[PDB]
Write an enzyme that holds these catalytic residues in place. Sequence first.
Site, short mmCIF file in Angstrom:
data_model
loop_
_atom_site.label_atom_id
_atom_site.label_comp_id
_atom_site.label_asym_id
_atom_site.label_seq_id
_atom_site.Cartn_x
_atom_site.Cartn_y
_atom_site.Cartn_z
CG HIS A 1 -20.07 -8.79 -27.38
ND1 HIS A 1 -19.16 -7.88 -27.86
CD2 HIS A 1 -21.29 -8.22 -27.54
CE1 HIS A 1 -19.80 -6.80 -28.30
NE2 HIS A 1 -21.09 -6.98 -28.12
CG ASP B 1 -21.87 3.85 -26.83
OD1 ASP B 1 -22.38 2.85 -26.30
OD2 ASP B 1 -21.47 3.87 -28.02
CG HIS C 1 -23.21 0.30 -28.92
ND1 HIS C 1 -22.99 0.53 -27.58
CD2 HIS C 1 -23.52 -1.01 -29.05
CE1 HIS C 1 -23.16 -0.61 -26.92
NE2 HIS C 1 -23.47 -1.55 -27.79
ZN LIG Z 1 -22.44 -5.54 -28.55
#
Ligand SMILES: [Zn+2]
EC number: 3.4.24.27
Length: 316
Positions: A146, A226, A231
Amino acid sequence: ITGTSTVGVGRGVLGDQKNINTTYSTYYYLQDNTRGNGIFTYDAKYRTTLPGSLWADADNQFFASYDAPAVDAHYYAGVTYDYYKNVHNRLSYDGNNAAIRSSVHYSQGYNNAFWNGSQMVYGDGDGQTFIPLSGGIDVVAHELTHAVTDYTAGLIYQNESGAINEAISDIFGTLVEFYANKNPDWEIGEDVYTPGISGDSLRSMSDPAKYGDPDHYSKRYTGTQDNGGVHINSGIINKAAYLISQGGTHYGVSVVGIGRDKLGKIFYRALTQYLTPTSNFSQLRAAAVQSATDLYGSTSQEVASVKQAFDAVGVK
Ligand SMILES: [Zn+2]
Ligand SMILES: [Ca+2]
Ligand SMILES: [Ca+2]
Ligand SMILES: [Ca+2]
Ligand SMILES: [Ca+2]
Ligand SMILES: [Xe]
């Protein structure tokens, strides 16, 4: 800290023995001077103020239960560093050898891990759903990826851009797992998820639908949960990546697999040269095609395979 580079030994979360690069200055610190400007692992001591204290050990032996998550955080950060350098000629997450810092024992029973903009943070899990999250090399590399993403494409963590952002991290988390070559698979988090249940995981790239994640664009989640399904809708891009690598026929569309290494090269180039903060799935397909084109030629199998994979998951 300033001191002399040494090598300690200990046991990770799954009880495996490994050597770790440490630094000696009265105490031995979890400070690896052998990679870029250092890899640093901290003790958050069950609280949430970060980073906590630089991990200090009196004898350079790390076999205490309490030591285990620190051992794997520090070690797997090194493995991840090694992948990006050796495989993509990238020097840490910013490409200029930034110090990699991680904190373990974050909070109490914390069933997660994350990149907070500046560092890695690992929960210990509640022992039911999760064991200390740093036990999973795919989880460690997902999260460090990330950082790589945030410094390159900058994909916004919402809706399709967010879902790509998650996919990228699952993709490279998986390629680092293969790189390390300990029980590699196309599943995510299996080493530290549900200690009581075997054969499961958090997500599957090979078949996202095994846990209710979409494997086709027509099945995408469109609510607001989310962050707009980052995800969840990642499964669509996860499946595309799996197919490019492994091949298969998915909803009637046949993909010729081209292997993990070409998968990684295509997606790394897309990530660093074509994607942008607001890229959507359709722009990811175009980026991946151009990347495969740059790398292998417009009449290559590689390009053809990328087109089939996105076709198969209904991304045009
Ligand atoms: Zn992640
Ligand atoms: Ca010790
Ligand atoms: Ca595995
Ligand atoms: Ca895995
Ligand atoms: Ca399990
Ligand atoms: Xe990295």
